Amino acid sequence: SATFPMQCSALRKNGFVVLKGRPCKIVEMSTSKTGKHGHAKVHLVGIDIFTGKKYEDICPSTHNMDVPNIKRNDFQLIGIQDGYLSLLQDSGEVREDLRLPEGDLGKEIEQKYDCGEEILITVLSAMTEEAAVAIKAM
Amino acid sequence: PQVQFKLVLVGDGGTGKTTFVKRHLTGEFEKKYVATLGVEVHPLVFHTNRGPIKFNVWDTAGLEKFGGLRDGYYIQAQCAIIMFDVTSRVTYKNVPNWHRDLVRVCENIPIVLCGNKVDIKDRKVKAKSIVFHRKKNLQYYDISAKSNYNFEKPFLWLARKLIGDPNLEFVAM
Amino acid sequence: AALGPPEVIAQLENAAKVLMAPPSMVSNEQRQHAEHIFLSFRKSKSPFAVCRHILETSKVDYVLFQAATAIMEAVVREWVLLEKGSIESLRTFLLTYVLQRPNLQKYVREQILLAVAVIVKRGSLDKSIDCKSIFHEVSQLISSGNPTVQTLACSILTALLSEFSNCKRVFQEEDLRQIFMLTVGVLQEFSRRENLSAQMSSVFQRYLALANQVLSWNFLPPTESWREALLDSRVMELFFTVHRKIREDSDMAQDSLQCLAQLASLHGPIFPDEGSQVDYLAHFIEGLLNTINGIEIEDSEAVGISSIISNLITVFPRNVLTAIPSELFSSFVNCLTHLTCSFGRSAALEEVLDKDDMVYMEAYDKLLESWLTLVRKGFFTQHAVQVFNSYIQCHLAAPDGTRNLTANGVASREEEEISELQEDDRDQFSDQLASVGMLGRIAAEHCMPLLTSLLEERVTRLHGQLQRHQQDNKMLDDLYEDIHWLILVTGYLLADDTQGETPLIPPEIMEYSIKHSSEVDINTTLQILGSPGEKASSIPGYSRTDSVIRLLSAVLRVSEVESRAIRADLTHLLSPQMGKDIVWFLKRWAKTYLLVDEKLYDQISLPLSTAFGADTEGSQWIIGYLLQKVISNLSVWSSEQDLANDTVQLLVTLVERRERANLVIQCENWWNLAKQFASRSPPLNFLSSPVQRTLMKALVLGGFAHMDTETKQQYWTEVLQPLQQRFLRVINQENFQQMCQQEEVKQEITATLEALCGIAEATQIDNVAILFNFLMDFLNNCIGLMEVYKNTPETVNLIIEVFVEVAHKQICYLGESKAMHLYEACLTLLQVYSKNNLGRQRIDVTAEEEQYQDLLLIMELLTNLLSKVSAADVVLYGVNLILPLMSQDLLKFPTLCNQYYKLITFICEIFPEKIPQLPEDLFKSLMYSLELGMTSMSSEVCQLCLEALTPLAELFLATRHFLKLVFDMLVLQNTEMTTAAGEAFYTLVCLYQAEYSELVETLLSSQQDPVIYQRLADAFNKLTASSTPDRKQKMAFLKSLEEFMANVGGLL
Ligand SMILES: Nc1nc2c(ncn2[C@@H]2O[C@H](COP(=O)(O)OP(=O)(O)OP(=O)(O)O)[C@@H](O)[C@H]2O)c(=O)[nH]1
Ligand SMILES: [Mg+2]
């Protein structure tokens, strides 16, 4: 698990790929060949699905690239413990290991939490990292 | 004494001028369309076998409403790039107008015509339909601002004409 | 601006020094301040005297430029206020101003002459200033011998010409002719005199270029005056002699040759009969040949000469071409062949020299194009042989050709990185390959054995080279290029493109096969065709084989070489380009030389009937051979996207027409390709998404060919049954939510959805109700999949894509009940998507991108839902569901914006009655979308909204609010004048006349000087006079709005 290999030619322009060690969403994928009769080589460039930094690489087609296994899950927010989100699965389980995200999203979580709204939190687990990435409120 | 030339980027609104320059500059392609107001001058450095060259590309506005001074920006311009959208025929019909304004404020400065967005399937303006390259100082290129396609070609041709060395080629720093 | 104070001139000059300063050293506040100084100065009321003073005193060229611009804009803004005497005095002031300053800065001079031309044309609009006064002044300016004054007159004429490009046409018939006659006279006087001075040669340049622009004017009117101007022989001989004199200028030569080409392009009703065309064409060919045969073509003249020749051949009809003297026609065609081969070799040299300006490639392209137009018993056979041999010599490698020869043999330089956007040779050089193919058809007796010999030699060379590459690296690519061009030429020789109809065997090929069918043993021919692995030279009597079938067998032997290289691990040594060539060729073969219908030809040769006939075993062999080819390519060529897609397209070609699908489904390779694809085996799962979609389309398409019930059930249960079984078992894996994220499940669901897209794409008229009933269950399961993959963007987007595919491909053939079921499914899917994405907020990593894609597909779904209980209510529920998702930033994606506004404006124009019946937030969102589309964004969007307002005038508060906006669109200053804007303005004016009189009176009260109030009053009165509370009521309101704009458009 964690990552599965896939021939570079088969990479979707809408999918993900591991670039320079980080899981990235592919934002551009262009093909070129050296000669007129040369074989194809792909120029990938993607955004780190967590940090947001741009990583790019050029590798020939037919060569295998590592594709990260991406999971995204919805927990309902039931607590904020000293900065650790207390999240409730629909199966009844509560996970208090994930921290609160920095930036305006953590500000939205604290504001909507002190206000008492039922807040749904989407956490993104990629390879070895997990992070809260989305908020849905009704 | 740095070697630099003034380049004026003209064309109909939404043909991908700001996209062309910004991708030429940062490396990111913006899918959203934010219309340019007046002009924005961006310096572009190219390392050649004869040294560095700087093109201060004046990214001008396509819409008449946001034109600003329009042809007033063409004064003392040393070279130009006219851009049109190969998927929008009206942007091609307007190319002789831009050519007229450039040739009025400037004169025989070398101009490069660029048909952008060749990466889109339904292409209305065919490549063989162009007669603009038939001149000693005029040239046409097929470019795609997305895929970084024929990006350096207008600047290499313009550099060869402005310097006068057809053996000039771009190299890595 | 004040006339006198030093602050005005000082402001303008300081602003000029700021704007002309190096931009990196001037803050944007200072820049915007300066350009605001100039822009506000140009918008002032009556700056004519002020600008006169600036032009007479300021010494800063930028300020003079901006002053001329101010005169230019003010004379049109306040045209109705100025008197004819003051306007003419201003025009003469500009003319004399630039006249008395010969060393004036160029762009200042040209800006002032632009002001003069604008004054003249604006005078032509109101019939105030005629062109004959400026023409007399120009004539007097030319009559003086001063080359600078002559240059000035030529500049004035060029300004008039550019400015005039009813007014344009009335200028076309009269004034343009006088300009052309002035230019022609100047060119005559210059051609007579020998040895021009340095300045006289420049006046000659500028007037020759002026003639070039005059002739190149769009649509010269067909009058007897233009007849006497153009059809006179002294003009043709004039430009021929002029070109002969300034030939070595390389710059005036192009202007003269473009003049001659434009004279050669005459074709309209300007020719009174067909005989004058023969006289004109004959004299033109005479002067052209006399000019060419005693002149070295050089570099600057090639494209001009070729453009003249191709103009003559393409423009004049064939009956006029054949009415000239036979000797003149023979000399013309001989010259065409000579220049064709010379330009061919020159262009082939330009390829290897890697020159920046390609001149001979364009000219050679024009000449080959003219050849194709000209040729399409045997007259051109010798010429066709010459041009064909020159093409084959220019595209073959060093030993037998001059493709890579520079008179040295350097073989070009380093391999140039080729992008995927670069067009293939068979597309870029399609016209040349078609021309050379036709010339090869009329001269087939020589060309076909040549192509067969070259193809056999290159085949053996490639076999030996590949065997050697196991135990000259550029020699392999040169060989690949040889086989490349040979395959292209052969393909365009043996069949056509048509792209709309069924391609037939070209008549020359069938005639050649019928005439020689007695000299060929069909058994040895079938042995050559049936054995593409062994050499043709070693077979019992290969010489007596049908030349056509031997050529097709040559390319087939190339295909066997490639396939045998695939059988070994030598796939890495092959050329994917050559693979594309062979696949394209076999595709073309399948459409012409497979299952020939004898009802489409008067007579078919016996060799082509027995080998490619309907019930013959030759066709059953070729179809299976192509199947094996597709299996090989799909087995190894996953990494080359072009080659893979072309291969699967060859498959679709083998299955499209039922005559071929009935024979392809009996092959075992078809069924093991079905199983191998449905098994998701290692080799085929490396293919991209569109390749697998097309493959699914081919298999489903094959499922509707001739089969008995046994193999029918076996086929459907071998193709569509594994999809149902795997999909239903995955969604029943005791998992409702937890297991979906794992790749073993997500990849299988993705594969199923892609396959569904292929099935939908295989839809035809007889496929619906069967394919649709198969897809509907998958849709109803895709509802729950939409609920399960909430946070998985790619899978949601894919599901929506299958709904878009089914709705687009099938709804046109569906009935009413089925379309109702599809409508319910789509509405439910949009309900789930809206429920999961309503108040969701995300961080970064291109979330706006993903919601943009989803919304784009949804918009296409609603559009195809509007293709066909009121049919449009479900679409209203859809736009109601996804409208809150339409953020202001998502409308900055121009594609999504255009689709959304096209959809909602189509809903407002057609079926407008359902708009007031919408809820409050829906109605407010729609009205705000229309106001935002009119007031900002694109002109296409604004015109779409204005087009949506007219069928919405027949709740009332937003319609009353539109009247103010449309009044500001036209009466105030977007600034695009449109017929739809006038229609919406009319309907909104006659609707609420109270707010209309309120706005008109409000504007008439806020005016300054009563001189404007009077003409505004007459204008608005003339507007209300034609309105007088549809068709006849608005038809006159449109013309009165045109007069209003032409009388109030300045008053800004
Ligand atoms: N498909 C495709 N889209 C492009 C390309 N270049 C630009 N675009 C898109 O076209 C739209 C317009 O691009 P811009 O560069 O902002 O247009 P512009 O030249 O700045 O026009 P104005 O500022 O109005 O004068 C944007 O949505 C770009 O993302 C291209 O090469 N291919
Ligand atoms: Mg711009």
Residue numbers in the entry:
A (entry chain F): 15 to 152
B (entry chain C): 7 to 179
C (entry chain B): 4 to 168, 185 to 240, 261 to 415, 422 to 516, 528 to 924, 949 to 1034, 1046 to 1064, 1067 to 1122, ...
Paper text:
In this paper, we report the first crucial step and present the x-ray structure of the RanGTP·Xpo4·eIF5A complex. Xpo4 has the shape of a toroid and is structurally closely related to CRM1, suggesting that Xpo4 might have evolved from CRM1. Xpo4, as all members of the importin β family, is an α-helical protein built of consecutive HEAT repeats. Eukaryotic and archaeal eIF5A comprises two domains, namely an N-terminal SH3-like domain and a C-terminal oligonucleotide-binding-fold domain. eIF5A contains a unique amino acid, namely an N-ɛ-(4-amino-2-hydroxybutyl)-modified lysine 50 (in human numbering) that is called hypusine.
The final model was refined against a native data set to 3.2 Å resolution, an Rwork of 21.5% and an Rfree of 26.8%. The asymmetric unit comprises two ternary complexes of very similar structure (r.m.s.d. of ∼1 Å). The superhelical arrangement of Xpo4 is interrupted by three anticlockwise kinks (between HEATs 3 and 4, HEATs 9 and 10, and HEATs 13 and 14) that bend the superhelical structure into a toroid-like shape, whereby HEAT 20 touches the loop between HEATs 2 and 3. Xpo4 contacts switches I and II of Ran, hence directly sensing its nucleotide-bound state. Instead, eIF5A sits on an unprecedented binding site provided by HEATs 8–16, and in particular by the intra-repeat loops of HEATs 9, 11, 12 and 14–16. The hypusine side chain bends in an L-shape and hooks into a crooked pocket that is formed by the acidic loop of Xpo4 and HEAT 10.
